[PDB]
Design a protein around this ligand. Structure first.
Ligand SMILES: COc1ccc(C[C@H](N)C(=O)N[C@H]2[C@@H](O)[C@H](n3cnc4c(N(C)C)ncnc43)O[C@@H]2CO)cc1
Ligand SMILES: N[C@@H](Cc1ccccc1)C(=O)O
Ligand SMILES: N[C@@H](Cc1ccccc1)C(=O)O
Lengths: 266, 785, 233, 157
């Protein structure tokens, strides 16, 4: 007899990592809203990570990010236009520096979303990591207002949690935005207010840093008569609440018994 | 329709050139498919006067004595050749667009033919070559190069959409250009009418068919060739001139989208009656075709006493008899508006497509008949010396068009423009609309010739096209989508990913026609197709495919004949029909298999395909398995149905050998499922850290028993701590109870928290060993060093 | 902002024609050479799963989906509906009886033609680069008014490519939609909105973009042919 | 503050700027489907492994590492993969595994890398004996990947 219910050739079946899944969904959501995804480098200079974003040194505000400083010659970090740049190297503490790199290399109006791995010197536990992911958002152009930032997050919530979903905005501080704000979303199933990220209207000094670097590079100013909003949200926190994952350390853990569990969600 | 530049230029004198005209018309909504320069006429062709025509004895040719400046003789075999007409004389030495070999002096049947008289085909102005061009005898001074009165012309092939039937008349086109700002010159139908009764009556027996019908009366007719200018005009529009009366009816038709027909009174009798045709009634149309009429055919008839007879097929084509010729002295001019649907059906029914039917099918100005009569009669008076009665016979009274509400503010809002009100209103007037009121909402009543203008929207398009679509700004809309539009793209996305996973996994996508050969229902052994085509492209594609795999097997075949693929892993997603339309996914496997090309071993056939599918589902995160079940089109030995998440959705197996035979093909493996596939939620299973238990043991079972039962039996009994469970070996042979087999099973147990003690396992494994026997199986795998 | 939804290949005359202002014995119905079908037992479901009646046929375009969607949802929205369509024609080098179209439908308050032009403009830019441009010319469609055909400038080929037709949803379409709605119990949802729609042929575009000479290959089945696109994924 | 959405034609040089990101994403998806299982490993590396795995020493170091084991920036991707294969063989006993990981590597310049790992009995009938494994199995898969990407492939000595 030709047993048809017998195991067939053991061809391998692949899968995508949960962060890749979460990031993808997040990118899909924003693509539908007109956002384009671009990435930045993990090793940045203090200039892009801090100074260009209105976060000076010995600044009590620079303590909001526990930085990993680097050392070593021979490494050539290129700027927005491929040009080699200088400054104390570090691991970006957020994706925000990409806001600056992009703006000097392009012209408004535009919509970008920049995903990426970030690093912060912290003790890795159940809900904390030294290595995680963020997703930046940047929309610049004439007449761009905070009403648009609120509109963006509102669409994010709807797409993420359904029609019974809602967002709340509260003032908060960031050197690169003003007005500044933190936003939370209403997750119906969990019946809880989830804090997703921060945002605001691009700070006046950011545009100045951008155009200053531009002239210093030969390009003409492109940000004097425009405004914009930016936002940044943590990927793991969201991936966890969405795939029901208890420990954030698994993401980098490597357990196949763990990763394999997302072959379904592709 | 063909649009002769200089003819159109007669209504729109300011036209820049054929090229600027094509641009103007494009922006008005009329695309030209071709611009053509048409009447190149050499110096050698001159106008000649036929002084006399002498038949050459013993032949069917004539010796023409022509006045072409000096007298010359020419031989012609054309039946229309005769004294008293003007002709196109190609003098010896002339190079004509056709023959390529110069025209010269030549001896024909005893006479020196000094050149030759031309037909439309020989001169290059028309396709007709059955007779000579016929001109007015005094059209020009004898010997005058013909080109001097017949310049080359440029003709545009215009596409005229169904909504602009008024554009089926050159004057219609002229109106649109006028709206753009060009001065419009309308012909003035100057009549010198006479007050007297028409020597005939009108009886419209079918008012639905002929909602408006008029008859004009012209007498004292002097039937002769049309002026050169009219023949040039008609030829450029694709029509062949016949004589002044007939030509005038064709020229006006082309001028104002109004077919009309001169009926020779000799055959009319006491009157004309527009009536349905009596079944069996015969009628020889002017195309020479002898036809028989249907009772649904509207007819133009005449009557004499108790006799009633067909004169023409209404709105389609006139009869051969009453058709106007040289001895015609008086006529009844038919200018009407027929029922589109009626003409539509008749035209189809008799396989006729004429300039007349075309226009009546598309629609004619419901109130244009009287003005059209004036034009035609006026022309008849000028070109045929006609006397015309001031009265017309008329039946029907169409009501003028109603007013349309119009708001300049809405026009700009709908378009996203900001045209000042005054320009909007003026545009509408240029097009001939009446505009009343003060605003914001006006009362605009369109001209009867514009059948397409009924809604306010139609009116905004008038403003848009005249201002120019290019003057409409570009913008992007911004809005929060209504709630129920949320995630509506899920289904489409789901299937797309399935294609991509498949595409990457190794399957090659194929696209096959939704049609199927009714015969294959028999061949591939399937239930007959439920939907059929009442008008298939061919009997081979007369039904709607019921399955997807048949098409795949077919492409495998034709692929093996054009190229010789040593193998192939295909797949196709498509709509299948049966009781209900549904989406299907089908795959096909064939060939040597997979492995080292230079080596020998191979992974092929059923299990190879089953492997891939297992992968696909592992990747989709859905439970998969194939149980035994036979299918007419499969192999009773290699056949089973597919279960996704414990739900039947299709089949899997080897094609039937017999089936492979009629189609001459090697063993083919395949499957077919129904989409969309089931969806399994993520119930994330946190993996325990504590080590797991490792245990083996085989199972003895009869050659029949499906791997299924065993696996399920073993599994369900393994307990709530069974982690893994895989098959690593099959034996069936010596020294086993002949007719039995052994199944090598790797097992693993684990626990969420605490670790597992040898007691819990050695004890839970028992709960499976004895339930394995309660069914009738043992545990060959025992005591392993 | 457009979302993709599909429709059925076997439609009723109502959705394919009548709901789209294309009546029978209409000289305008000749712009589509229809494949009529026969056979009982087949159950065609409407926008809300309800069984519907009428002479069955193979959709001659995707447009009928505009109607199905509108009765099942509420404005404002943006959809794009791809799909296989059928027309009785002689299959040659640049003609097929079986091809594909992509519909576009955007409805909502204040939606204007400026938005339709904006949509196509973005389509061109995305498809052919910044040196790309679109041109709109009036043309006729029973389901739109104003009506229009649009062409795009393809820099490499230096030619004006005719891509499809479009226009502002016809007043009668919205009426048919809301009429079917009430006849079904739903409330009207299209009396105070406007919208634009467009439809473009897929093969013509695929051909110009992948440099394919014969449109018959698509359904041909030659692996030597299909295999050539493993690169473009 | 009201809610609203912005509407505008993006400046020309923002056109197709998402190409790069999309390109890599498809590569992950093709890989994911082809059979490779994605893994995410720390960008940090043990300076010691430069010796162990026999590699040129890492160019960038951390003036404030989390621990000496994570004091440098990974120079390769495969080392991390071999490590996870190990710790995977200790917690659970995978009889095989086909992994892959895409990540940023550092050396003279930051660059993106794709690494894969094969191990185990192989592929074939579980109850049977023959197997498709080792080098050529992995080389097969890669040949597939590239046939699918439509790019010329080959491995020289
Ligand atoms: C019945 O109702 C009608 C018929 C025709 C028309 C169209 C057009 N006004 C017109 O020229 N009407 C008619 C006819 O006048 C003309 N014609 C063209 N060729 C001939 C011909 N021979 C070639 C022998 N004999 C008699 N008439 C001829 O062709 C047109 C096509 O029928 C309008 C109403
Ligand atoms: N970079 C910020 C997030 C943020 C991005 C942009 C604007 C405002 C906040 C953080 O690390 O929290
Ligand atoms: N359905 C039309 C295309 C189109 C769609 C929508 C609006 C206008 C035109 C066709 O077949 O040509």
């Amino acid at each position: 007899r030709v047993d048809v219910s017998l195991p067939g050739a053991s061809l391998f079946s692949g899968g995508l990592h949960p962060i890749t899944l979460m990031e993808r969904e997040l990118v899909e959501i924003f693509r539908a809203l007109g956002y384009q995804a671009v990435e930045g480098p993990e090793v940045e200079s203090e200039f892009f990570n801090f100074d260009a974003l209105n976060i000076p040194e010995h600044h009590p505000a620079r303590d909001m990010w526990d930085t990993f400083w680097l050392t070593g010659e021979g490494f050539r970090l290129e700027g927005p236009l491929g040009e080699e740049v200088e400054g104390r190297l570090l691991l970006r503490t957020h994706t925000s520096p990409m806001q600056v790199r992009y703006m000097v290399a392009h012209t408004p109006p535009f919509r970008i979303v920049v995903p990426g791995r970030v690093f912060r010197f912290e003790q890795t536990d159940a809900t904390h990591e030294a290595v995680f992911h963020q997703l930046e958002g940047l929309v610049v152009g004439e007449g761009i207002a905070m009403a648009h930032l609120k509109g963006a997050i509102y669409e994010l919530a709807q797409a993420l949690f359904g029609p019974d979903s809602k967002v709340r905005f509260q003032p908060v501080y960031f050197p690169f935005v003003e007005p500044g704000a933190q936003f939370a979303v209403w997750w119906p199933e969990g019946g809880k207010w989830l804090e997703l990220g921060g945002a605001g209207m691009v700070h006046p000094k950011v545009f100045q840093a951008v155009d200053a670097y531009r002239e210093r590079l030969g390009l003409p100013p492109a940000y004097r008569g425009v405004t914009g909003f930016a936002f940044g949200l943590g990927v793991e926190r969201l991936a966890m609440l969405r795939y029901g994952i208890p420990d954030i350390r698994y993401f980098f853990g490597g357990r196949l018994k763990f990763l394999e569990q997302f072959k379904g969600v592709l | 329709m063909r649009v002769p530049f200089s003819w159109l230029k007669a209504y729109v004198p300011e036209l820049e050139s054929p090229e600027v005209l094509e641009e103007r018309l494009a922006g008005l909504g009329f695309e030209t498919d071709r611009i053509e320069r048409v009447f190149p006429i050499p110096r050698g062709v001159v106008f000649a006067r036929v002084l006399e025509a002498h038949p050459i004895p013993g032949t069917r040719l004539k010796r023409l004595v022509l006045d072409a400046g000096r007298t010359v003789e020419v031989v012609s075999g054309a039946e229309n050749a005769r004294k008293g007409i003007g002709v196109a004389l190609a003098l010896p030495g002339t190079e004509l667009p056709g023959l390529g070999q110069k025209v010269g002096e030549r001896v024909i049947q005893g006479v020196r033919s000094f050149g030759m008289a031309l037909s439309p085909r020989e001169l290059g102005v028309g396709e007709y070559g059955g007779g000579l061009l016929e001109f007015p005898e005094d059209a020009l001074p004898p010997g005058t190069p013909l080109s001097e009165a017949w310049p080359e012309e440029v003709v545009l092939d215009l596409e005229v959409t169904p909504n602009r039937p008024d554009a089926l008349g050159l004057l219609g086109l002229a109106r649109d250009l006028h709206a753009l700002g060009y001065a419009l010159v309308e012909p003035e139908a100057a009549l010198k009418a006479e007050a007297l009764p028409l020597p005939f009556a009108l009886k419209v027996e079918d008012p639905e068919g002929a909602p408006h019908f008029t008859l004009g009366y012209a007498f004292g007719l002097r039937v002769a060739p049309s002026p050169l200018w009219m023949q040039r005009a008609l030829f450029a529009a694709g029509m062949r001139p016949i004589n002044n009366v007939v030509d005038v009816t064709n020229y006006v038709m082309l001028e104002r989208a109004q077919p009309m027909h001169a009926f020779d009174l000799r055959f009319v009798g006491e009157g004309i009656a527009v009536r349905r045709a009596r079944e069996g009634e015969r009628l020889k149309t002017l195309d020479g075709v002898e036809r028989t009429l249907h009772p649904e055919d509207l007819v133009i008839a005449g009557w004499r006493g108790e006799e009633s007879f067909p004169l023409g097929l209404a709105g389609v084509m006139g009869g051969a008899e009453s058709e106007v010729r040289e001895d015609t002295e008086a006529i009844a001019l038919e200018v009407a508006c027929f029922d589109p649907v009626s003409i539509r059906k008749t035209a189809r029914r008799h396989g006729l497509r004429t300039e007349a039917s075309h226009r009546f099918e598309r629609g004619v100005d419901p109130l244009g008949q009287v003005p059209a009569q004036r034009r035609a009669l006026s022309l008849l008076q000028a070109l045929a010396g006609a006397r015309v009665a001031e009265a017309l016979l008329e039946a029907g009274s169409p009501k003028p068009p109603e007013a349309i509400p119009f708001r300049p503010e809405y026009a700009n809002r709908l378009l996203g423009t900001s045209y000042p009100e005054a320009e909007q209103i003026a545009i509408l007037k240029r097009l001939g609309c009446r505009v009343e009121g003060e605003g914001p909402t006006y009362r605009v009543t369109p001209p009867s010739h514009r059948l397409d203008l009924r809604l306010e929207e139609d009116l905004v398009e008038e403003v848009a096209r005249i201002q120019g679509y290019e003057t409409i700004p570009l913008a992007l809309p911004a809005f929060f989508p209504a709630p129920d539009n949320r995630g509506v793209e899920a289904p489409y996305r789901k299937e797309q990913r399935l294609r991509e996973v498949l595409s990457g996994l190794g399957f090659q996508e194929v696209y096959t026609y939704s049609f199927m050969d009714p015969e294959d229902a028999r061949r591939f052994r399937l239930d007959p197709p439920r939907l059929l085509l009442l008008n298939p492209l061919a009997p081979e594609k007369a039904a709607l495919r019921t399955h997807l795999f048949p098409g795949l097997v077919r492409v495998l075949k034709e692929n093996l004949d054009l190229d010789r693929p040593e193998r192939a892993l295909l797949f196709e997603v498509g709509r299948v029909f049966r009781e209900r339309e549904e989406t299907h996914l089908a795959g096909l496997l064939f060939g040597e298999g997979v492995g080292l090309p230079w080596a020998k071993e191979r992974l092929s056939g059923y299990f190879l395909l089953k492997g891939y599918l297992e992968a696909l589902f592992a990747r989709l995160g859905l439970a998969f398995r194939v149980e035994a079940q036979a299918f007419p089109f499969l192999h009773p030995g290699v056949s089973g149905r597919v279960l996704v998440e414990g739900e039947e959705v299709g089949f899997l197996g080897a094609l039937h050998p017999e089936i492979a035979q009629e189609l001459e093909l090697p063993p083919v493996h395949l499957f077919e499922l129904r989409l969309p596939l089931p969806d399994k939620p993520l119930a994330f299973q946190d993996p325990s850290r504590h080590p797991a238990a490792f245990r083996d043991l085989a199972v003895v079972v009869p050659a029949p028993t499906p791997y299924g039962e065993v696996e399920a039996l073993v599994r369900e009994a393994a307990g709530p701590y069974l982690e893994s469970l895989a098959l690593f070996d099959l034996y069936q042979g010596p020294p086993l109870p002949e007719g039995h087999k052994s199944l090598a099973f790797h097992l693993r147990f684990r626990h969420p928290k605490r670790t597992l003690r040898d007691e819990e396992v050695e004890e839970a494994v028992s709960r499976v060993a004895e339930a394995l026997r309660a069914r009738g199986f043992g545990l060959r795998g025992l005591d392993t060093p």
